[PDB]
């Protein structure tokens, strides 16, 4: 597990070093902010129907009355530009605030404790997460348990030993063709079927698909001793 | 999940069939380009929402021809290959119960960009997710697909909510009838009640109203002698025609800016809704969620998504 | 008729395509309007006949190109319009030129529309193909069979949120 | 106006075009000819009065 974790960390390091598009999510915010700032700055060059786009040029050419009309047009244009920029900034800030609340939840759940939410901390069963400081954002290294290899095995919902159905307490019953063994869904580790690992409910005539097998009794060797 | 994709041509919409009007827009400068880019970004964000919500796996799953799920009848939710477009019986009402204007809007500069993902492909994504849930349960989204009988999947889901799975194998016959009755009741309610999809109908109505208002604002005088650029060009001299066209451009640009701002706000709302839908798909549909009432009233067991126009409908199974 | 021309009818000036109209006007009605209230159809003052007015410039134009550092090849996409002016192909998104249609489905590289994506792949050129939904996997389903993983790998997933 | 690549470069105001799809402008159709149709009136208005 430690070797796999180290290999994954090294792979992430190499991908970040080579592929810069991995941070494209923050690059998009940076590019949008830069584009908005550049557009707002450039709008100062727009005439907006006035004779000139420079306030000083208008002030140095026309009389106070005509200069007033020209400056009124210029101010209307610049105020519209400012209002559009502020609206775009407010919308982007609301989006980034929603993302920041999501990131705070992601931290509090994944990193601090353990999160049972599916895919909230990333694909696979989550174990822990490691935040990483990034410009105008944060990068999370999500550690998850992903099964690699699987093999099909015969299973049965219950075991019929003495006419009373036995159900797993945890995991599932599996068989490789020799005997029925107990293992968890997420991992393969056969265990001897026994009362401590099961419980008695119903009967063998109610459960559908039940099979017959011997259930080990831990008290049997002790009682005979 | 997704909002109607519209790419309003700020050039054609205002200065359609006018050259002096375009020259005047050049004086204003970057508003036209900024609005076009904002609408393109809105479309891109809607496509991203669709991809993030509908696509949760890297593979496509199909149910076997022989189906033995312990009594449940998923034919209502599963796709029907006989139809010209793959879809389930429930999806028929979802698409049919949600609603020329399009040609008129297009002639006015309102370009309706088709979604990057077609309804047929949305149906295929839904079918793949349903097949994964039915066969592999919650294991197909967490890694390599693991085949598990549906009865044992329900047993584990009951164990996760505090109900011992022994109840399942005892009630397997009655629970099948309960689920079938619930599915039939949902089908009947959707067929009779067209307001069930009112949530998506509201989004459709908002988009239609915004587009109609934007189109109608063209006919408004906006303080000018006439609302038609051609009439101004054929009536007034370049000096006065320019003043009238400037008034019309100011009015139409204010209308378009208001439309774009409101559409961006609606797109933010749709993005929040799509994030919620993706979270629900990941938790309720793919796996199991312990969140109370997040997947619906009662103790959630599993959810079966269904495709709807400009959105998605989730069938949440609860105890 | 059947051509984009600049028309001046009864003092109304505009650009559009003139075609025979299937709409029936009343004897007194002369000027028709669409849903948007713009010009829809008019009656010729000399020889009374109804002509539909369709504004020209159908659809839009889009450019599909890869990174300049890779190649300069481009493909032009016309939105919701068939190939009129014009490697001339058609797809769900409209007339597409400069891209080679390929039946094989691949991962979406450059979105086109209506489930169509384009990519720059092999002596390389832009191609048009149906968007791939992922590798097709058929998981066997049986009541008595289950899959229990025999091995596991701990992987770290990189996620970025502003 | 040289090729679609140059049009995209001008639209983006940059010579570096990233991989993807971009919208530059609309599809324009130039009118073939000017058509004039007016009512047939052979009488001049009475400007004398």
């Amino acid at each position: 597990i430690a070797n796999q974790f180290n290999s994954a960390i090294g792979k992430i390091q190499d991908s970040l070093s080579s592929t810069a598009s991995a941070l494209g999510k923050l690059q998009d915010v940076v590019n949008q902010n830069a584009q908005a700032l550049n557009t707002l700055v450039k709008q100062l060059s727009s005439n907006f129907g006035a004779i000139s786009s420079v306030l000083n040029d208008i002030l140095s050419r026309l009389d106070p009355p005509e200069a007033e009309v020209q400056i009124d047009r210029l101010i209307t244009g610049r105020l519209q530009s400012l209002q559009t920029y502020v609206t775009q900034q407010l919308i982007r800030a609301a989006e980034i605030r929603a993302s920041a609340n999501l990131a705070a939840t992601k931290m509090s759940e994944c990193v601090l404790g353990q999160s049972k939410r599916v895919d909230f901390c990333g694909k696979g069963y989550h174990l822990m997460s490691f935040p990483q400081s990034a410009p105008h954002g944060v990068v999370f290294l999500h550690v998850t348990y992903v099964p690699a290899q699987e093999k099909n095995f015969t299973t049965a919902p219950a075991i019929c030993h003495d006419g009373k159905a036995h159900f797993p307490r945890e995991g599932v019953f599996v068989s490789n063709g020799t005997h029925w063994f107990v293992t968890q869904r997420n991992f393969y580790e056969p265990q001897i079927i026994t009362t401590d690992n099961t419980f008695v409910s119903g009967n063998c005539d109610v459960v559908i698909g039940i099979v017959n097998n011997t259930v080990y009794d831990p008290l049997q060797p002790e009682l005979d001793s | 999940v997704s909002m109607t994709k519209t790419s309003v041509d700020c050039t054609m919409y205002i200065c359609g069939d006018s050259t002096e009007c375009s020259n005047l827009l050049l004086q204003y400068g970057s508003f036209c380009t900024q609005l076009n880019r904002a609408l393109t970004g809105i479309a891109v964000e809607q496509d991203k929402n669709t991809q993030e919500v509908f696509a949760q796996v890297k593979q496509i799953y199909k149910t076997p021809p022989i189906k033995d799920f312990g009594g449940f009848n998923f034919s209502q939710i599963l796709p029907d290959p006989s139809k010209p477009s793959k879809r389930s019986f429930i999806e028929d009402l979802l698409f049919n119960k949600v609603t020329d204007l399009i040609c008129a809007q297009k002639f006015n500069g309102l370009t309706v960009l088709p979604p990057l993902l077609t309804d047929e492909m949305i149906a295929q994504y839904t079918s793949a997710l349903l097949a994964g849930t039915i066969t592999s349960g919650w294991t197909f989204g967490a890694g390599a697909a693991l085949q598990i009988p549906f009865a044992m999947q329900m047993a584990y889901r009951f164990n996760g909510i505090g109900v011992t799975q022994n109840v399942l194998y005892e009630n397997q016959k009655l629970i099948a009838n309960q689920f079938n009755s619930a599915i039939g009741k949902i089908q009947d309610s959707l067929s009779s009640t067209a307001s069930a999809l009112g949530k998506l109908q509201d989004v459709v109505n908002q988009n239609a109203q915004a587009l109609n208002t934007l189109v109608k604002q063209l006919s408004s005088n906006f303080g000018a002698i006439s609302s038609v650029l051609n009439d101004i060009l054929s009536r007034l001299d370049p000096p006065e025609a320019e003043v009238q066209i400037d008034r019309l451009i100011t009015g139409r640009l204010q209308s378009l800016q208001t439309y774009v701002t409101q559409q961006l706000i609606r797109a933010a709302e749709i993005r929040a809704s799509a994030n919620l839908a993706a979270t629900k798909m990941s938790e309720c549909v793919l796996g199991q969620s312990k969140r109370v009432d997040f997947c619906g009233k009662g103790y959630h067991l599993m959810s079966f998504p269904q495709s709807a126009p400009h959105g998605v409908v989730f069938l949440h199974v609860t105890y | 008729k059947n051509k984009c021309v600049n028309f001046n009818f009864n003092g109304l000036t505009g650009t559009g395509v003139l075609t025979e109209s299937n709409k029936k006007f009343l004897p007194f009605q002369q000027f028709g309007r669409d849903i948007a209230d713009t010009t829809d159809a008019v009656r010729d003052p000399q020889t009374l006949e109804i002509l539909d007015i369709t504004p020209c410039s159908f659809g839009g134009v889009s450019v599909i190109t890869p990174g300049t550092n890779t190649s300069n090849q481009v493909a032009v996409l016309y939105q919701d319009v068939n190939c009129t002016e014009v490697n001339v192909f058609q797809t769900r998104a409209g007339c597409l030129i400069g891209a080679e249609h390929v039946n094989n489905s691949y991962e979406c590289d450059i979105p086109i529309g209506a489930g169509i994506c384009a990519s720059y792949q092999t002596s390389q050129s832009i191609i048009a193909y149906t968007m791939s939904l992922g590798a097709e996997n058929s998981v066997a389903y049986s009541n008595n069979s289950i899959a229990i993983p025999t091995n596991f790998t701990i992987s770290v997933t990189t996620e970025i949120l502003p | 106006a040289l090729d679609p690549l140059s049009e995209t470069k001008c639209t983006l105001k940059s010579f570096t075009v990233e991989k993807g799809i971009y919208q530059t402008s609309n599809f324009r159709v130039q009118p073939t000819e000017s058509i004039v149709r007016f009512p047939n009136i052979t009488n001049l208005c009475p400007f004398g009065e």
Side-chain angles (χ1 to χ4, degrees), chain B residues 224-293:
Chain B
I225 295 166
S226 65
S227 63
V228 183
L229 296 172
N230 292 336
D231 291 343
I232 290 164
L233 293 173
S234 297
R235 281 187 300 98
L236 291 174
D237 282 338
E240 303 298 321
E242 277 180 350
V243 172
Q244 294 299 318
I245 295 164
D246 178 66
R247 290 184 183 175
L248 284 179
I249 290 166
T250 302
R252 293 177 183 172
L253 178 65
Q254 288 180 154
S255 298
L256 180 63
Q257 287 173 336
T258 300
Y259 167 81
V260 167
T261 295
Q262 296 181 338
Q263 285 292 99
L264 283 167
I265 296 162
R266 293 186 185 90
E269 292 300 323
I270 292 294
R271 279 187 296 275
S273 295
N275 288 337
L276 180 66
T279 301
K280 286 176 177 177
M281 191 74 77
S282 293
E283 300 178 353
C284 313
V285 166
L286 166 58
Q288 191 176 0
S289 183
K290 294 182 180 297
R291 298 170 65 179
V292 179
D293 297 344

Side-chain angles (χ1 to χ4, degrees), chain C residues 4-10 44-46 57-59 61-65 67-68 72 74 76 84-85 109-111, chain D residues 4-5 8 15-39:
Chain C
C4 181
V5 296
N6 190 340
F7 60 89
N8 188 340
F9 300 156
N10 292 282
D44 178 68
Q46 294 180 336
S57 298
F58 296 155
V61 173
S62 295
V63 178
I64 299 99
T65 187
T68 55
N72 289 337
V74 300
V76 179
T84 56
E85 186 175 2
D109 180 65
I110 297 167
Chain D
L5 180 63
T8 299
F15 299 165
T16 302
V17 180
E18 293 179 350
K19 183 178 77 179
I21 184 166
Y22 303 131
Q23 186 174 355
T24 59
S25 178
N26 65 342
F27 178 81
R28 294 181 181 175
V29 177
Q30 190 176 356
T32 301
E33 186 62 15
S34 178
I35 308 304
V36 177
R37 299 286 291 173
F38 293 151

